[PDB]
């Protein structure tokens, strides 16, 4: 006989993954931090009604644009800060902190989810 090969190890088992768990190693953690100033419409007449003056004029510096974070909400990736327009896909450059996609790296290279598979692997 000559009935010794099926399938033990692929589609046997066809059970639905997580969308990256094994690649916990290339995968970045996307940390939204909110803004605390702002939030409150009764604070106050934003930057105007109310002299608040504030000492720090660097507050958290980019990676992706080089300057300083001004925008609301800021992102992480990798160890970096980031911010809508600048935390993107290198590929798409879709503003992934516009979207909350969980990107993935490599090469240094920021690519979204499917973009890292596609790409590289
Ligand atoms: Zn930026
Ligand atoms: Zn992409």
């Given at each position: 006989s000559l009935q010794n090969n099926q399938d033990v190890s692929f589609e046997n088992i066809q059970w639905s993954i997580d969308p990256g768990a094994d690649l916990s190693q290339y995968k970045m953690d996307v940390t939204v931090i909110d803004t605390?100033?702002?939030?409150?419409?009764?604070?106050?007449?934003?930057?105007?009604?109310?002299?608040?003056?504030?000492?720090?004029?660097?507050w958290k510096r980019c990676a992706g644009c080089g300057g300083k974070i001004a925008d609301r909400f800021l992102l992480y990736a990798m160890d970096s800060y980031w911010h809508s327009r600048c935390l993107?896909?290198?590929?798409?450059?879709?503003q992934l902190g516009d979207i909350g996609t969980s990107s993935y790296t490599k090469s240094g290279m920021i690519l979204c989810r499917n973009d890292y598979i596609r790409l590289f692997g």
């Open positions: 605390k100033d702002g939030s409150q419409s009764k604070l106050g007449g934003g930057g105007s009604g109310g002299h608040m003056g504030s000492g720090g004029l660097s993107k896909c290198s590929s798409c450059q879709a």
